[PDB]
Amino acid sequence: KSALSAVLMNRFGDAFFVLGLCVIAYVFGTLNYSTIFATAYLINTDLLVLIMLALFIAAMAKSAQFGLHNWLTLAMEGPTPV
Amino acid sequence: GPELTPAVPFFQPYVLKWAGVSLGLVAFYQFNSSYEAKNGHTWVETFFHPKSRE
Amino acid sequence: ILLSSLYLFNRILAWQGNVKHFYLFASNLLLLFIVVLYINFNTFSNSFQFNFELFNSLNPFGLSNSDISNGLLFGIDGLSLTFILLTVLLIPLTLLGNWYNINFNSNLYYTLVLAIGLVILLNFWALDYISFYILFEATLPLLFILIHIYGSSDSERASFYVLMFTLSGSLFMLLSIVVISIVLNTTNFINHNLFVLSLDLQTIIWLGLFIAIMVKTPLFPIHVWLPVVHSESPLAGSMILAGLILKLALYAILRLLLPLLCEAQILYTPMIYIISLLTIILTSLATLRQIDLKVIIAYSSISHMGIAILGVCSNTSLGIYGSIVLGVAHGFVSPALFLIVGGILYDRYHIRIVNYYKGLTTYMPQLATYIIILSFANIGTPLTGNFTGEFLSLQGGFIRNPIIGGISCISVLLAAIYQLKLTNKLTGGISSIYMHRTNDVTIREKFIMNILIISTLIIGICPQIMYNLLYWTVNNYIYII
Amino acid sequence: LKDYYYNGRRILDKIPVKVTWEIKREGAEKEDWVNQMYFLYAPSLILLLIVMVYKS
Amino acid sequence: ELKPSSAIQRGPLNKGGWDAPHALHNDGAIDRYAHWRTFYQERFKYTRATGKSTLIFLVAFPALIGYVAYQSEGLFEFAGKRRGESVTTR
Amino acid sequence: KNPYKKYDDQQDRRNLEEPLSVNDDLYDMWSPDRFTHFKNQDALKYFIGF
Amino acid sequence: PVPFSAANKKLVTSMYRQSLKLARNWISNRQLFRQKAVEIRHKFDQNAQISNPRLLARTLDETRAHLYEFRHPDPIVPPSFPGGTKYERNVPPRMEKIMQHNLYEP
Amino acid sequence: AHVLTKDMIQERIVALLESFDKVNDAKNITATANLTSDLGLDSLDVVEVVMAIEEEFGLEIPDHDADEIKTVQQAIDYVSAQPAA
Numbered sequence A: 001k002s003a004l005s006a007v008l009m010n011r012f013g014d015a016f017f018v019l020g021l022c023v024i025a026y027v028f029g030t031l032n033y034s035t036i037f038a039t040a041y042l043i044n045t046d047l048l049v050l051i052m053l054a055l056f057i058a059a060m061a062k063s064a065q066f067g068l069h070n071w072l073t074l075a076m077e078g079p080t081p082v
Numbered sequence B: 001g002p003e004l005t006p007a008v009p010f011f012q013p014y015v016l017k018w019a020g021v022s023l024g025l026v027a028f029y030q031f032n033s034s035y036e037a038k039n040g041h042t043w044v045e046t047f048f049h050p051k052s053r054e
Numbered sequence C: 001i002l003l004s005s006l007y008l009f010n011r012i013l014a015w016q017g018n019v020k021h022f023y024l025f026a027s028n029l030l031l032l033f034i035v036v037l038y039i040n041f042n043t044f045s046n047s048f049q050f051n052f053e054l055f056n057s058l059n060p061f062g063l064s065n066s067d068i069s070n071g072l073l074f075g076i077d078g079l080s081l082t083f084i085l086l087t088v089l090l091i092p093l094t095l096l097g098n099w100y101n102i103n104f105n106s107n108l109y110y111t112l113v114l115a116i117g118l119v120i121l122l123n124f125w126a127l128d129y130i131s132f133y134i135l136f137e138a139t140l141p142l143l144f145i146l147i148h149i150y151g152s153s154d155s156e157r158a159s160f161y162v163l164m165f166t167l168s169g170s171l172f173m174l175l176s177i178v179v180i181s182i183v184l185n186t187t188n189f190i191n192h193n194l195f196v197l198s199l200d201l202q203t204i205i206w207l208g209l210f211i212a213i214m215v216k217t218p219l220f221p222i223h224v225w226l227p228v229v230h231s232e233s234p235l236a237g238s239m240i241l242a243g244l245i246l247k248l249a250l251y252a253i254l255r256l257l258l259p260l261l262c263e264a265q266i267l268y269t270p271m272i273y274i275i276s277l278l279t280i281i282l283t284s285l286a287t288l289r290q291i292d293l294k295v296i297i298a299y300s301s302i303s304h305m306g307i308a309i310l311g312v313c314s315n316t317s318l319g320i321y322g323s324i325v326l327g328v329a330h331g332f333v334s335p336a337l338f339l340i341v342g343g344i345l346y347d348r349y350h351i352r353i354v355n356y357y358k359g360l361t362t363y364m365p366q367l368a369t370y371i372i373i374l375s376f377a378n379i380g381t382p383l384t385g386n387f388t389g390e391f392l393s394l395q396g397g398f399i400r401n402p403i404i405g406g407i408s409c410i411s412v413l414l415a416a417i418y419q420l421k422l423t424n425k426l427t428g429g430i431s432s433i434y435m436h437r438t439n440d441v442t443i444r445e446k447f448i449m450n451i452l453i454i455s456t457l458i459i460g461i462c463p464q465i466m467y468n469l470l471y472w473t474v475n476n477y478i479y480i481i
Numbered sequence D: 001l002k003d004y005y006y007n008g009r010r011i012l013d014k015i016p017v018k019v020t021w022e023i024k025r026e027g028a029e030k031e032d033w034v035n036q037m038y039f040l041y042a043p044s045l046i047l048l049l050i051v052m053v054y055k056s
Numbered sequence E: 001e002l003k004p005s006s007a008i009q010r011g012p013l014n015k016g017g018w019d020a021p022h023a024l025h026n027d028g029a030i031d032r033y034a035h036w037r038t039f040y041q042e043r044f045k046y047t048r049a050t051g052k053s054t055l056i057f058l059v060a061f062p063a064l065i066g067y068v069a070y071q072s073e074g075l076f077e078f079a080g081k082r083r084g085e086s087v088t089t090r
Numbered sequence F: 001k002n003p004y005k006k007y008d009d010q011q012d013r014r015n016l017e018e019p020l021s022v023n024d025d026l027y028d029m030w031s032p033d034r035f036t037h038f039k040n041q042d043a044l045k046y047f048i049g050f
Numbered sequence G: 001p002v003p004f005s006a007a008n009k010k011l012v013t014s015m016y017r018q019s020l021k022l023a024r025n026w027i028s029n030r031q032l033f034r035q036k037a038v039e040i041r042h043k044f045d046q047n048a049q050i051s052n053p054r055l056l057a058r059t060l061d062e063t064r065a066h067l068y069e070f071r072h073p074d075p076i077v078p079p080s081f082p083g084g085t086k087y088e089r090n091v092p093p094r095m096e097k098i099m100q101h102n103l104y105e106p
Numbered sequence H: 001a002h003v004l005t006k007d008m009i010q011e012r013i014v015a016l017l018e019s020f021d022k023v024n025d026a027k028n029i030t031a032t033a034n035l036t037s038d039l040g041l042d043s044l045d046v047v048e049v050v051m052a053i054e055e056e057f058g059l060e061i062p063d064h065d066a067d068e069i070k071t072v073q074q075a076i077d078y079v080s081a082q083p084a085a
């Protein structure tokens, strides 16, 4: 059950990650770091906020911020070296 | 010193099958690319005979 | 040849008494023949290539060499070649997955299975509305008989569902095809984008075509037949129904609807997006409260089909490519999951209730590993074709309508939920008390599963490998001024 | 014959060769589908993969 | 006096096969639960609760999605939009 | 259910032929965990209040 | 509700054990745990002889309420038991022979 | 690792009871002694003793099985019946 918790909360994060990737591919035409960092300073700010918000929800789940933390303490069911 | 379980042969049928197919595929890829560098075209392309577009 | 090969069939039947080795050999030859056709297929051309006509008035029993075309037309382009390859990859596996569990009247069973496969393969060759419709319907009586005679306890209701629902949608498609026939006096797919009907008549013809699409895909809210039919079908029926037959609807959208009714399709796209979003969300949530393994697996297909619909109706090249890739990857992975639940577990225990299953990892570690792999493939883990299809479909959907595709992005989570909820209970915990230990997966079962996993992995790592057959297709159907 | 062979194999756990019911199950066990699936179907699939690679 | 022909010899219908040992120990309670869950449609009735679910999912939710999908049709264009540019077209 | 009683399936805390509720899938061992120390309403109060 | 009976004894003994478990759960320091434990035993001793029904039932109800007011969020359990960190870890498999399901195929 | 024996369990329980101050006598503690009768332990006192036993061998006694042990031999056979202790 602890494993199911972790995988599902991080799939919630990954859903917002996929949303962000779709926005990024549509707006920038690419996923490469070079091009996105080349042209990001000219981009409309509402679009950048949409992209960054989706990416931050993903990172929030990964880094266990107070929105989506619950799996972090459940993960102590695994062996200690894990 | 921990106990010993029965001896098991390293190269099982699955090892031989999967390694053989994979390595043969890579060997075929390299042979085709070399045959292309020499002959001018991939050796696999020679078997391609579609009707002309016209 | 045909005379001699019929003699060969007859003698084999006389001596062996089981037709199945001959059918396996014939299907393997068919796959090799299709690969030879692919070798000789020209990719730098958007024209149909291996054309032939049947039942022309000048040669009713031969091929037509006449200046008047009144028979049924057949031929292939890249789009149809893709699905034909999927079909001929799948057919021998559907024969091999029932090699040992059919014992009474097995010759008829294998004949039905092979006939259904051949009908679908011919359906992908059809080049006009009438030939397409004929091969579209011809599977229904074969499926009715197969499910009625060789299905599980509730297979009578299931056979009646698989006949009646599909007939119901097909008859409205038939209304549309009749209207096209009498209004245009032509029915073929080669030049049907050259005919521009008035917008009003377009709007009317679209409705019949889309009702048939809604039942065959299926889409919400006319999906409820598919879990029953999948659950009660024998294994070959389920494999064909999930891997091939549902793909006919996506193919129908591309081949029958978009080239002819372009403007009406533009007008109707938001309604399609409503229906597909309802399909994805509601069927994904309904899966969470199912107690039959085969029903759960069947419900999964509906949500993936919704994602594919959203891609194929997105009016973008990425969306259409994603829809096709998703169709192929689902055709690999869903038959594997049906093999696990209705072929391996069901042949060992003869029961499908989820309460009975727990902790299979102890005695069957290999089956548990297969379950884990196929589960993460089914929920779109990257490097799997399922991820490529879903990701591209969602890109196209989001471009077509940012709000609707953005909300559609929740399918990642929802699919993860129902699938991993099943696999968590199947593999973890202490071995169940209700079942005795059985054999782990056999060599035949592993062979089938390995074929399907390697296929999905190959197109997951390099999806571009399909592009040489599809790059015309991703431009043939979008409507931009 | 098939009924006798497979029933003896299934109950006794012994192969009916060697000739009195030997236990030697390790190897020498080919199923009736292997030749077709490994020498026709599988090479066909490999050829399809090669063709797709070079067609691309 | 009207009887089937004496020339007909009918035997039993046996499907044959090997009776395997019973690997599953059936629980009657679980089977009854599964039967109730599988054939729920045969017992369904329209009450306040079930009707409320019917109205939420078959009427309300489609109407919300439809309003959204017909209001926002053609509204957004995002490709390469720059600062100060409108991302909306209307 | 107290886990020191004996059950035919110890992990699931179920005995053979025990009747199932119609919503049994929401009450078995694999269902989401339930917390006893506070009532759900009071826990909502505390969480919102924090 | 008997002033002195086997059922009454079972109840009071279960409850006094509950009190000592609770006190151990709540108090980190061992010395103070012994203090509070001694005091619990004193409280349990003083009300031992209550005879009339109303007073005994009232004292039992009020001590039940006291215990419920002092319940611990997470008791201490040894790891190998139901609430334990090691419960059902590495459960040794049942030893069991392979039942066959198919005449032809293992 | 570490493994206990029946005599180790017995020696630990005997030292445990010897440490208790409410007991009648130390020399009179037998393997088959009754705590209720021979040692004259109160209703609550035997509870305190069972709690001491579980705090000593690191196990958890349910209510129904705690009240069942009446003799020292009963305690020893119970503690040897438990794998992790």
Ligand SMILES: CCCCCCCCCCCCCCCCCC(=O)OC[C@H](COP(=O)(O)OCCN)OC(=O)CCCCCCCCCCCCCCCCC
Residues within 6 Å of the ligand: C049, C050, C051, C052, C054, C063, C115, C118, C119, C121, C122, C125, C134, C135, C138
């Ligand atoms: C009952 C359901 C309704 C039935 C209505 C339809 C019944 C059809 C009966 C099946 C017969 C169709 C398949 C045979 C026709 C193909 C014969 C042929 O030669 O194709 C001609 C085509 C071009 O050939 P040609 O112009 O002569 O030039 C050759 C140069 N060397 O050459 C080619 O390009 C090769 C074409 C390959 C086509 C692949 C066909 C795959 C399936 C073949 C068998 C299907 C059997 C289905 C049985 C169930 C009934 C549907």
